[PDB]
Design a protein around this nucleic acid. Structure first.
Ligand SMILES: [Mg+2]
Ligand SMILES: [Mg+2]
Ligand SMILES: [Mg+2]
Ligand SMILES: [Mg+2]
Ligand SMILES: [Mg+2]
Ligand SMILES: [Mg+2]
Ligand SMILES: [Mg+2]
Ligand SMILES: [Mg+2]
Ligand SMILES: [Mg+2]
Ligand SMILES: [Mg+2]
Ligand SMILES: [Mg+2]
Ligand SMILES: [Mg+2]
Ligand SMILES: [Mg+2]
Ligand SMILES: [Mg+2]
Ligand SMILES: [Mg+2]
Lengths: 145, 75, 140
RNA sequence: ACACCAUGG
RNA sequence: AGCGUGUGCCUACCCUACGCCGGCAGGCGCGGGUAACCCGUUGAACCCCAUUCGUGAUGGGGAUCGGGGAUUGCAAUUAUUCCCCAUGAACGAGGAAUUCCCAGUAAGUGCGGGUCAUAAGCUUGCGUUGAUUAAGUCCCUGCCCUUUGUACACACCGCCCG
RNA sequence: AGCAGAGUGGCGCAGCGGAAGCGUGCUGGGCCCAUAACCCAGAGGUCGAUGGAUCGAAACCAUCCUCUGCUACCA
């Protein structure tokens, strides 16, 4: 039924219209399953459609709700950047601002040279896990001279 | 693994072949219909429920993990 | 402190508030900007004789000649949070043997003073010794 | 109708 | 379902019902129990019955990491523990080797006690679903008893020749 | 200078166009009370260099270079 164009190019990422919407839009970063289901419910569109069955007047509404969530009554405890450390905002950072925020957070930490930044610099484990018997990336060392 | 490129929904050729197989198959299950054509297997369930609605196939068993139909309780 | 595009002017300020207001904000009003642990710490509020360190952080920035920095308020208190008052002063934070010095920047607000002097040497490995593998055992 | 099987801070 | 535990002398902390508040962790308020008396008729999990997925490292897997919220405590950074949104690694049944097991047993599955201001991937007990294979032998690894041989007795991991 | 042979894993080598392994060495496991022997896996490649043919090569052709054996031994 209705073999129409399926491959979508949503902002800076490729979606396949061969999948269901609630699991197709998770291909974008910052959008998981629990977030995408809510973004699709608030937009009043159906949830049994393949992602190719959406004409150009649904996708636009879906993304404008996906990017301005607090406008459409998506709560605060549910967003992936809350009390933004340097601006006090609440937001979902979605596609490319995610990598920029992550690198900005790592660089902020390394700047004041806190301990987390020093573990991020030396490529070690940042939480409090033992590193004596895990990680194990290098090569075997020979004991016979 | 491998690459099974199945169809997410029918086209007219597969759509007529799906109605031209009804008298042929003694056992009808979603997996058999998936293997005959190139169907995403979750579309085969909808196709068989549609065929059942039109009286074209007869349900012999339905369970959570298995469904079975047969051709018009004949032959 | 020469920080000039990311704290006061231009891009950003601590959760949208600028340092000059953080210098007058009462601790009750300020603990609403802080994260959960720092808020809980001040809500328990058991500043004990962690007070008196504030009396030598302060009163050391007034004995100091202008256009310069206070010298060192060396301490064992690794678990101090960084209130915006302590911005600017120099502190010597004990690590188990040594008072490594720190110049407090407006970016460290709400971290722990212990989170700026490490307790061990970052290791560079030697050469594996006699017990290092089962391939090694024998001597006469 | 019998493959190999050495040595000991 | 079954085995349990429950207010502590020094030692200051126990198990919780039910109403309200909060998405959640959690908070406030009032009661019972020193216990076959209250939590408790212990509404446990796997299992059972219906939806969506469809052979694609996928909606399998949940490592690593960012941001936020609670509780215990005198104090949580080298994240104590817990909750929420996000990031989404190896891994497609495992080389030479090698462990444990005979019937309510192996294995799957959850629940208590111990340590415990906080807290089990540990161990110690309890139930729940419940097989395949044997009724043998001395081959391999060892053990017991008799006969026999010995240059061993620190006892074959011995002794000893050039 | 010439003839002949060779140029591939640290080292000896196999590889008659559908294209990278063998034997040894090296490192770590196994077996054993322990060591050698023996078993396993891992690491390490401009297939001498340069062009050309071929749908495609390490291999075929042409030029050059580098080793080895044998005569030539040459103002
Ligand atoms: Mg022996
Ligand atoms: Mg010898
Ligand atoms: Mg000898
Ligand atoms: Mg001896
Ligand atoms: Mg399991
Ligand atoms: Mg247990
Ligand atoms: Mg307890
Ligand atoms: Mg426990
Ligand atoms: Mg233990
Ligand atoms: Mg054994
Ligand atoms: Mg006997
Ligand atoms: Mg005798
Ligand atoms: Mg003797
Ligand atoms: Mg001997
Ligand atoms: Mg001798």
């Amino acid at each position: 039924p209705e073999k129409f164009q399926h491959i979508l190019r949503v902002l800076n990422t490729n979606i396949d219209g061969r999948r269901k919407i609630a699991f197709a839009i998770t291909a974008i970063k910052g959008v998981g399953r629990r977030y995408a289901h809510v973004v699709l419910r608030k937009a009043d569109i159906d949830l049994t459609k393949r992602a190719g069955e959406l004409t150009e007047d649904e996708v636009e509404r879906v993304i404008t709700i996906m990017q301005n969530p607090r406008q459409y009554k998506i709560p605060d405890w549910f967003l992936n950047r809350q009390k933004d450390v340097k601006d006090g905002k609440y937001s979902q950072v979605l596609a490319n601002g995610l990598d920029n925020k992550l690198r900005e957070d790592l660089e902020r930490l390394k700047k004041i040279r806190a301990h987390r930044g020093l573990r991020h610099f030396w490529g070690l484990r940042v939480r409090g896990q033992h590193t004596k018997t895990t990680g194990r990336r290098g090569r075997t060392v020979g004991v016979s001279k | 693994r491998d690459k099974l490129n199945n169809l997410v929904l029918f086209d007219k050729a597969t759509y007529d072949k799906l109605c031209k197989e009804v008298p042929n198959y003694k056992l009808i299950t979603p997996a058999v219909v998936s293997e005959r054509l190139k169907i995403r297997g979750s579309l085969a369930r909808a196709a068989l429920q549609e065929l059942l609605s039109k009286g074209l196939i007869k349900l012999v068993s339905k369970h959570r993990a298995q469904v079975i139909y047969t051709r018009n309780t004949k032959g | 402190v020469e920080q000039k595009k990311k704290r006061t002017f231009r891009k950003f300020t601590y959760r949208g508030v600028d340092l000059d207001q953080l210098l007058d904000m009462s601790y009750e009003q300020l603990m609403q900007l802080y994260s959960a642990r720092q808020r809980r710490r001040l809500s328990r509020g058991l500043r004990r004789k962690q007070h008196s360190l504030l009396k030598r952080l302060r009163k050391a920035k007034k004995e100091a000649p202008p256009m310069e920095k206070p010298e060192v308020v060396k301490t064992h208190l690794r678990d101090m949070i960084i209130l915006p008052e302590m911005v600017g002063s120099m502190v010597g934070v004990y690590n188990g043997k040594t008072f490594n010095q720190v110049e407090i920047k407006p970016e460290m607000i709400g971290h722990y003073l212990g989170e700026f002097s490490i307790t061990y040497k970052p290791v560079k490995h030697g050469r594996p010794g006699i017990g290092a593998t089962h391939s090694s055992r024998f001597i006469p």
